[PDB]
Each structure stands twice: as structure tokens, then as C-alpha cells.
Amino acid sequence: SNANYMETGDQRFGDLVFRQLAPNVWQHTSYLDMPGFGAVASNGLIVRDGGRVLVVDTAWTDDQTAQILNWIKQEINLPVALAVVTHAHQDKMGGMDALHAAGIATYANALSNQLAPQEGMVAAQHSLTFAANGWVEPATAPNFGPLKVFYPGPGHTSDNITVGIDGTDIAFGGCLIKDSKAKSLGNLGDADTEHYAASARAFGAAFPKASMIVMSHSAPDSRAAITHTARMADKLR
């Protein structure tokens, strides 16, 4: 349960893995086997804000996403107010149904909702919209607490968004940022290779105080993950 700094190690629950990040923040992790590679991790976040819990990124599947809700009931014992999912893809949207069944309000980039059916995903219930500088329109993100939503520009996909957690110095780059040892940009099937670099860089500028970068396929890293990701993307153009 990691109650204090002398109880450590990731918590295994079902097939899921949870790692505490800051006092109110955890990374949730699920796995799906992929041709030729094998098991691939997909990370998302759980934020405790006051008397509610906020989730970013469901798991790969409905039944894994259900497990996440269960773990929250056991370990945090708080209601889940809302969830924000970061683009329409199985790794971040696979479990929308489970969130919905649980009666949990869901939010995504309007564009992610427009693409969901074509990407084989269930759309979120609410749509976020963004200014030209990339920050979310606050009226579209009511009651987001510490979550600061930023759309960096096309990237891993054209709809990808990102989230800072105010006060924790943690920024979630999702599929857009890779860690500093990464050998490639991962899955580019949907990517905008022209704007990727600028988008990665825009993310770094949106959260200039983040000391912890959380991404989809790897353990959290330093800001060196932004820099390195941008250099890799520079090679795309």
C-alpha cells in the first residue's frame, strides 16, 4: 500500500501494476501482447484531488480498466469524478465502456471523439476544445482540479493531448514523448512527421517546471525525455 517511504515497490493488482509518483499521483499499467514484440506496457495516471479521484488514460481493455477502478476502490476508497483520455487509440481508449458503466464522466479532445468510431473506439461523453496557443478552453474542462490540459499539435497523432498535474511537477506526454534511452518514436502509423518535433517541444514549454515526464510505454523520466524525443522527431523532417 506504500503508506510511507519505508514501504516501497510497485503494487501488483490482478494483471495490472501501480507505482506511486507523488503524494497524490499514481501510474497505472496494463499489458497487451503485440506481434513480434510480445507484451507492451501502457501507462496512465490516477490523481487524488480532495475527496475525488481523476483518471487520465483507461487501460488497453475494458476488463483491465475495470481492474483499475477496483484497485482505486480498495486503495484510495474515493469516488472517481471524471476521466480524460489523450487520443483515440486502443492504448489510451480501449476501456471507455468500463468507465461509462461505472457512471464516470469522460472527456476527450473533440477531435478524438470525432475519430473514435473510425479508430474502433467508443467516444468520450464530453469534448474539450483548445485555443490557438494550445491550452484547453476552461469552460470545456469544468472542475479539472490540478489537471492542466494542453494540446501540443499533431504528433504521435493529430488529436493527441497532454496533461500537467499542477503542484506535482509531473507532466504526462502520453504516446507523444519517449524516454531518453528510446531507440525510436514507437508507433508512427498515425503520426504527423512534419509537425512532431515542434509539438514535442511545445509540450516541454507548456510545462517548463515539470521534473517528471510520464509516457505511455516506459517508466517516468527526466526532462531529457522531451529533448531526446524532439531530436528523434527532427530526423523525421
Binding-site sequence positions for Zn(2+): 87, 89, 91, 156, 175, 217
| Among candidate residues 109, 114, 83, the one with its CA nearest the CA of residue 98 | 83
Closest contact distance (angstroms) between CB of 96 and Cl ion is 16
159 binds Cl ion (CB under 5 A): no
**204: its cell numbers:** 516541454
Applying CB under 5 A, which part among 19-27, 55-63, 113-121, 179-187 lies near Cl ion? 179-187
Annotated binding site for substrate: 178, 187
186 binds Cl ion (CB under 5 A): yes
Q: In the β-sheet with 105-109, what is the strand arrangement from edge to edge?
A: 11-13, 16-22, 25-34, 38-49, 52-56, 80-84, 105-109, 126-128
Closest contact distance (angstroms) between CB of 89 and Cl ion is 5
Q: Rounded to whole angstroms, how far apart are CA atoms 171 and 44? A: 11
Annotated binding site: 87, 89, 91, 156, 175, 178, 187, 217
Query: 469544468: which residue's cell?
Result: 142
Closest contact distance (angstroms) between CB of 217 and Cl ion is 6
Residue spans of beta strands (DSSP E) within the chain: 11-13, 16-22, 25-34, 38-49, 52-56, 80-84, 105-109, 126-128, 147-150, 162-165, 170-174, 212-215
- Residue 113: strand, helix, or coil: helix
Query: 497524490: which residue's cell?
Result: 24
Is the alpha carbon torsion for 95, 99, 100, 101 positive or negative?
positive
Cβ-based nearer residue to Cl ion, 133 or 184: 184
Q: Rounded to whole angstroms, how far apart are CA atoms 42 and 92? A: 8
Cβ-based nearer residue to Cl ion, 44 or 146: 44
Cβ-based nearer residue to Cl ion, 58 or 168: 58
By Cβ distance, which residue is nearest to Cl ion? 186
> Which of 175, 177, 191, 200 contacts Cl ion by CB under 5 A?
175
66 binds Cl ion (CB under 5 A): no
Closest contact distance (angstroms) between CB of 144 and Cl ion is 24
Number of residues counted as binding Cl ion (CB under 5 A)? 4
91 binds Cl ion (CB under 5 A): yes
187 binds Cl ion (CB under 5 A): yes
Binding site for Cl ion (CB under 5 A): 91, 175, 186-187
